[PDB]
Amino acid sequence: STFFSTFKCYGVSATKLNDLCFSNVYADSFVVKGDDVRQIAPGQTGVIA
Amino acid sequence: STFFSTFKCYGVSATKLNDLCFSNVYADSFVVKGDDVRQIAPGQTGVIA
């Protein structure tokens, strides 16, 4: 059903998420416009960041 | 005539293609939707990969 236009993982490889166990898991949610999505990453400047 | 929205070379630099000779060349063709193009790359996960 659900498909994503952006997927990025930083401290782990994407092909090893099935063999791991995760601790202290949190999820954040909000809405922005298309041109502002690139700002959601470490070491970024701009209005959102 | 032809223009590409995506182009990414991996084991060679893009400015060296005109000076080399290539062996065992093969081409693969298929169709996906726009959101799935990002999965055509080494180390990716998803339904396509």
Curated annotation (Swiss-Prot), chains A, B:
Function description: Attaches the virion to the cell membrane by interacting with host receptor, initiating the infection. Binding to human ACE2 and CLEC4M/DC-SIGNR receptors and internalization of the virus into the endosomes of the host cell induces conformational changes in the S glycoprotein. Proteolysis by cathepsin CTSL may unmask the fusion peptide of S2 and activate membrane fusion within endosomes.
Name this polypeptide is given: Spike protein S1
